[PDB]
Design a protein around this ligand. Structure first.
Ligand SMILES: *[C@@H]1O[C@H](CO)[C@@H](O[C@@H]2O[C@H](CO)[C@@H](O[C@@H]3O[C@H](CO[C@H]4O[C@H](CO)[C@@H](O)[C@H](O)[C@@H]4O)[C@@H](O)[C@H](O[C@H]4O[C@H](CO)[C@@H](O)[C@H](O)[C@@H]4O)[C@@H]3O)[C@H](O)[C@H]2NC(C)=O)[C@H](O)[C@H]1NC(C)=O
Ligand SMILES: *[C@@H]1O[C@H](CO)[C@@H](O[C@@H]2O[C@H](CO)[C@@H](O[C@@H]3O[C@H](CO[C@H]4O[C@H](CO)[C@@H](O)[C@H](O)[C@@H]4O)[C@@H](O)[C@H](O[C@H]4O[C@H](CO)[C@@H](O)[C@H](O)[C@@H]4O)[C@@H]3O)[C@H](O)[C@H]2NC(C)=O)[C@H](O)[C@H]1NC(C)=O
Ligand SMILES: *[C@@H]1O[C@H](CO)[C@@H](O[C@@H]2O[C@H](CO)[C@@H](O[C@@H]3O[C@H](CO[C@H]4O[C@H](CO)[C@@H](O[C@H]5O[C@H](CO)[C@@H](O)[C@H](O)[C@@H]5O)[C@H](O)[C@@H]4O)[C@@H](O)[C@H](O)[C@@H]3O)[C@H](O)[C@H]2NC(C)=O)[C@H](O)[C@H]1NC(C)=O
Ligand SMILES: *[C@@H]1O[C@H](CO)[C@@H](O[C@@H]2O[C@H](CO)[C@@H](O[C@@H]3O[C@H](CO)[C@@H](O)[C@H](O)[C@@H]3O)[C@H](O)[C@H]2NC(C)=O)[C@H](O)[C@H]1NC(C)=O
Ligand SMILES: *[C@@H]1O[C@H](CO)[C@@H](O[C@@H]2O[C@H](CO)[C@@H](O)[C@H](O)[C@H]2NC(C)=O)[C@H](O)[C@H]1NC(C)=O
Ligand SMILES: CC(=O)N[C@@H]1[C@@H](O)[C@H](O)[C@@H](CO)O[C@H]1O
Ligand SMILES: *[C@@H]1O[C@H](CO)[C@@H](O)[C@H](O)[C@H]1NC(C)=O
Lengths: 215, 226, 490
């Protein structure tokens, strides 16, 4: 069948600039049968352009399509923070539909320093045998950030998992949630748990901590 | 303005049969102007069209070649729905499955999938389902706003819904994507950014729902003191 | 006796309830897809927005201008479009305007009735005459904007009132001359046996001699008033001389050049948004033509006599019925993706797929058809309007018939141009179908033969992969030739 290849695989842009996404085809494609879709995180694909150049109902003039043969292009003229999504090109050949791998478009923003929070484990959870302490970075840019776990000034490796949120469609920031899982018995042995944070919007690494127990 | 609603996100064991349904609202399955498609999406395979069915004085069904053998799409007129069956499922069949309607857009032809369903994640695993364990994330002294949240832990399979005050809280909410622990179970976190003065007077309730295990938990998050 | 051979059928798109379209060869051809070009429907009501509409419920534009008592609500009133109802009447001293339509159009073009009084000094003569034809309120009255001058004592002198203009806009002065019915009435009101009224600015002068005749009875009077108008430009002066029978003005009407007009209709008014106004309601300006009415206001489609003009954007729509065969007998209602398709029947089973190289070749030509029709009819419209303006020399008096034949000649060309494209559309769609049957026959060569119903019979076993090789431009007949000929010759 026909295979669609999208370049670039990732795209980073500042608002107001213009995005151009290319869709390459193994074989020649009928111009009327190539469409473009927008998939915002957690939602189904939303139809943007159909028939190569035709705008769907509810999409502005910023989105325009073009191309023929094995080369099709989708342009977003006036970018907005709301335009963060994964854009796919789709074709139909006769008996089959085919999609491209997608182009992840993330919108640039002025650098923002993260707000660091740290939550000790709940007493209810301790009675169950495990202990999860959570460190939280909130509303920052760019996505590149590093969290270092320190228990009694001893670096930790491999007992922690972190999760990053998708780019916010309004403020265009990220959010990270690194959690460190210990046994209950291992949790009591030590007493001061810290969370070191390194980021570009921070002149020096930040460390939020709590002496175990409270008050 | 059709509305497509699919079945529940669940778990189906290996070598079994996958079975979903799409209940159409605002249109008929026997429409002479529409065709009903099934599409799945996974990180490994991407967006993959599975098949379709349409009525033109006769029921026509088309299937993709990669899945032709083990699939059957059957329309039900009496309930105005159409279902998807996939057989001898393999771990490669874990994806989000989309109900989508196709309608001609160019001079009476060129069918295009324009109305989409919500999509139901189905996991093909030989493991038992398990509900979550919600734990509070209470805030302490201020560092000028405070932050609280919840820790939904040890559940299978995906996915879990997390609301705050039964949908009344939207600004500042950050539900994080799950992380798969070494236990083969999932862990998830959801935090809210809220003014420090808002504590005490107002109470924040963490609504957690995990359909595959049929659990609906609601934990009140409150600051701890001495 | 078994799965030794396969069948490949060619067909096209088809629907049960197609649309009938006009062409040159046929009066009506049912095609798969088309679009309507005339706006024959209408909501029936007039939309209050975006234009400023003014409903003159019972008062004509002239009656509101002059000052008929029941029109007194329309003072200083402005409008984008004034509408006159059928019920509108006059209930004031009987009158007549020699150039009624000319004055009505002049005041309508300016979207305002803004009147300001002026300090005329009619010395030696009584002002504010009155009649019971217009009782105004409880007592007798007259037109609001007109001052009826009648004799003072036993003397009516020669009035020579001058009034310069020192403003940037143009002034409109409305006045009149009274035509009594007896010499007794003329003497009693104006003393003199015969009057005059002279109004001038600069080179222009109007001099009216009243006529004593008995006119047809209106509202208890056989006397009449004749209304005239006079425009003074900046720097000009207005001079009024009369020895009798002068219906003087109170002031003037400030007229502004604008995009206002007027139209007679009885359609109700509603709160809605419509750009195009017609006497029988409002219509959407999305279609190129409209059949709803000849007179319109605003950005409107062109008027067309016939109530239907469909532009074919599909192909010959032949349906299915009863009881496999190709395009010779019936199209395929099951093929929906494209207008030309393949169907087959082999060892694996029946299948179907569309040919998009030919379908795209038809779509790419149908694409710019509607825009092409609009550009041509627009040129022919303004052509028929530019010419056909002179009319072999004209007489204003009896041209009612020329518009009736303008619409006919314009509707003929428009319906012809649509029929030209519909013929071309049927031609090119049938062409791509026959070109596909030629491309496949050439491809199969002696390995198959025309079954006569738009299908072929491939005398060798051709699996789905072999069938896709025929749909694709890559099918080598030499490899299957020996096998197919063995079966042939047997
Ligand atoms: C030639 O071929 C073209 C297509 O190539 C056909 O044009 C389409 O015809 C269909 C006819 O049903 C049109 O669909 C109708 O659209 C109406 C307007 O939709 C607006 O409102 C909805 C809801 O807000 C928006 O989502 C939408 O984007 C528009 O803004 C609807 O009112 C109609 O609804 C009715 O039918 C549907 C089923 O389709 C039901 O679900 C509804 O409940 C309701 O009963 C309908 O959807 C379509 O808009 C036309 N254009 C296009 C570009 O597709 C021609 O009809 C065809 N000509 C022939 C065969 O002669
Ligand atoms: C027009 O239609 C023809 C007929 O279908 C196409 O040619 C055929 O292409 C198919 C593949 O789509 C060939 O069928 C088989 O494919 C094998 C590869 O399978 C791959 O499948 C997926 C990709 O879909 C991969 O992920 C997977 O890992 C496999 O690698 C081929 O290797 C086989 O072909 C064998 O025979 C041919 C000669 O017939 C040799 O040239 C090959 O090297 C190989 O030995 C297998 O048959 C089928 O063979 C093709 N037929 C012909 C006659 O070439 C055209 O590609 C298509 N053209 C266009 C423009 O659409
Ligand atoms: C689309 O719109 C067009 C334009 O609006 C319509 O075409 C016109 O339709 C009318 C019919 O509605 C045609 O006839 C005209 O109507 C006259 C109404 O009759 C009334 O006449 C007097 C009112 O002026 C009444 O007597 C009055 O007498 C005095 C005034 O002198 C007054 O004081 C008193 O109170 C009373 O009101 C009289 O009793 C009667 O009621 C009719 O006389 C005459 O035939 C007119 O011609 C009109 O000719 C049409 N014009 C055109 C250009 O076509 C069309 O019908 C609409 N079509 C659709 C489908 O909606
Ligand atoms: C229609 O508009 C005209 C003028 O555009 C109005 O006529 C005149 O309006 C002026 C005020 O704009 C009146 O002058 C006033 O006089 C009093 C003293 O009497 C003075 O105190 C005020 O400051 C002002 O100067 C003038 O009298 C008036 N002329 C007449 C004959 O009434 C007219 O009123 C408007 N009509 C409607 C229905 O809006
Ligand atoms: C108008 O009024 C008086 C009559 O007593 C005269 O005033 C003259 O008006 C004209 C108008 O163009 C002027 O050119 C003269 O200069 C005026 N003369 C005087 C002495 O005022 C005049 O006779 C009358 N006008 C007419 C044409 O009858
Ligand atoms: C019912 C029947 O005879 N089916 C035949 C099958 O036996 C044969 O193996 C095949 C060869 O391609 O063709 C088909
Ligand atoms: C439309 O289809 C019905 C059957 O579905 C048929 O009876 C009718 O004749 C068709 N209309 C036309 C104009 O052919």
């Amino acid at each position: 069948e026909i295979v669609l290849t999208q370049s670039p695989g990732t795209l980073s842009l500042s608002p107001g600039e213009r995005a151009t996404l290319s869709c390459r085809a193994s074989q020649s494609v009928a111009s009327s049968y190539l469409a473009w879709y927008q998939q915002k995180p957690g939602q189904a694909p939303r139809l943007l352009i159909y028939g190569a150049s035709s705008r769907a109902t509810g999409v502005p003039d910023r989105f325009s399509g073009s191309g023929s043969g094995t080369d099709f292009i989708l342009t977003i003229s006036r970018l907005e923070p709301e335009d963060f999504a994964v854009y796919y090109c789709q074709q139909y050949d006769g008996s089959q539909y085919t999609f491209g791998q997608g182009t992840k478009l993330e919108i640039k923003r002025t650098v923002a320093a993260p707000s660091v929070f740290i939550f000790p484990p709940s007493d209810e959870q301790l009675k169950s045998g495990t202990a999860s302490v959570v460190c939280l970075l909130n509303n920052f840019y760019p996505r590149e950030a590093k969290v270092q776990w320190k228990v009694d000034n001893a670096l930790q490796s491999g007992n922690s998992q972190e999760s990053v949120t998708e780019q916010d469609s309004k403020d265009s920031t990220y959010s990270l949630s690194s959690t460190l899982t210990l046994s209950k018995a291992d949790y009591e042995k030590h007493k001061v748990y810290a969370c070191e944070v390194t980021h570009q919007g921070l002149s020096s690494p930040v460390t939020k901590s709590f002496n175990r127990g409270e008050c | 303005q059709v509305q497509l609603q699919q079945s529940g996100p669940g778990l189906v064991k290996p070598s079994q049969t996958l079975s979903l349904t799409c209940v159409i609202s605002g249109d008929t399955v026997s429409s002479n102007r529409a065709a009903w498609n099934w599409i799945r999406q996974s990180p490994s395979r991407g967006l993959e069209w599975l098949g379709r069915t349409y009525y033109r004085s006769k029921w026509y069904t088309d299937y993709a070649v990669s899945v032709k053998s083990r699939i059957t799409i059957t329309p039900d007129t009496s309930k105005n729905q159409f279902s998807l069956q996939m057989k001898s499922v393999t771990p490669e069949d874990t994806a989000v499955y989309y109900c989508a309607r196709g309608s001609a857009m160019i001079f009476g032809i060129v069918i295009i999938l324009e109305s989409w369903g919500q999509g139901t994640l189905v996991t093909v695993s030989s493991a038992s389902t398990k509900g979550p364990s919600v734990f509070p994330l209470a805030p302490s002294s201020k560092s000028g706003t405070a932050a609280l949240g919840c820790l939904v832990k040890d559940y299978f399979p995906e996915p879990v819904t997390v609301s705050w005050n039964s949908g009344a809280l939207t600004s500042g909410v950050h539900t994080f994507p799950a992380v798969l622990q070494s236990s083969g179970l999932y862990s998830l976190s959801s935090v809210v950014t809220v003014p420090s003065s808002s504590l005490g007077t107002q109470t924040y309730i963490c609504n957690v729902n995990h359909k595959p295990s049929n659990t609906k938990v609601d934990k009140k998050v409150e600051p701890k003191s001495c | 006796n078994d799965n030794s051979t396969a069948t490949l059928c060619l067909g096209h798109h088809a629907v049960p309830n197609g649309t009938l379209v006009k062409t040159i060869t046929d009066d009506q051809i049912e095609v798969t897809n088309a679009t309507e070009l005339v706006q024959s429907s209408s909501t029936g009501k007039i939309c209050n927005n975006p234009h400023r509409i003014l409903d003159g419920i019972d008062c004509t534009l002239i009656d509101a201008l002059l000052g008929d008592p029941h029109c007194d609500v329309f003072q200083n009133e402005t409008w984008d479009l004034f509408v006159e109802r059928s019920k509108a009447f006059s209930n004031c001293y009987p009158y007549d305007v020699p150039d009624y339509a000319s004055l009505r159009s002049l005041v309508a073009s300016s979207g305002t009735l803004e009147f300001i009084t002026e300090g005329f000094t009619w010395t030696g003569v009584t002002q504010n005459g009155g009649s019971n034809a217009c009782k105004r309120g409880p007592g007798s009255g007259f037109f609001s904007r007109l001052n009826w001058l009648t004799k003072s004592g036993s003397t009516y002198p020669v009035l020579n009132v001058t009034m310069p203009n020192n403003d940037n806009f143009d002034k409109l002065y409305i006045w009149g001359v009274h035509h009594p019915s007896t010499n007794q009435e003329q003497t009693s009101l104006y003393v003199q046996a015969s009057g005059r009224v002279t109004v001038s600015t600069r080179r222009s002068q109007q001099t009216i001699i009243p006529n004593i005749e008995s006119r047809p009875w209106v509202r208890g009077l056989s006397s009449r008033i004749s209304i005239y108008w006079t425009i003074v430009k900046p720097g000009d002066v207005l001079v009024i001389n009369s020895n009798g029978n002068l219906i003087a003005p109170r002031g003037y009407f400030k007229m502004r050049t604008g995009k206002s007009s007027i139209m007679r209709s009885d359609a109700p008014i509603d709160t809605c948004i419509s750009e195009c106004i017609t006497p029988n309601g409002s219509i959407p300006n999305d279609k190129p033509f409209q059949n709803v009415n000849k007179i319109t206001y605003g950005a409107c489609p062109k008027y067309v006599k016939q109530n239907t003009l469909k532009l074919a954007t599909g192909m010959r729509n032949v349906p299915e019925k009863q009881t496999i065969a190709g395009f010779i007998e019936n199209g395929w209602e099951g093929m929906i993706d494209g207008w030309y398709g393949f169907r087959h029947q082999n060892s694996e089973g029946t299948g179907q797929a569309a040919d998009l190289k030919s379908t795209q070749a038809a779509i790419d030509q149908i694409n710019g058809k509607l825009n092409r029709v609009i550009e041509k009819t627009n040129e022919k419209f303004h052509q028929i309007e530019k010419e056909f303006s002179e009319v072999e020399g004209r007489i204003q008096d009896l041209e009612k018939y020329v518009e009736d034949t303008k619409i006919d000649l314009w509707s003929y060309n428009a319906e012809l141009l649509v029929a030209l494209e519909n013929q071309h559309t049927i031609d090119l769609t049938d062409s791509e179908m026959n070109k596909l049957f030629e491309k496949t026959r050439r491809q199969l060569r002696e390995n198959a033969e025309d079954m006569g119903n738009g299908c072929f019979k491939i005398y060798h076993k051709c699996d789905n992969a072999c069938i896709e090789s025929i749909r694709n431009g890559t099918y080598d007949h030499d490899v299957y030739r020996d096998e197919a000929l063995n079966n042939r010759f047997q």
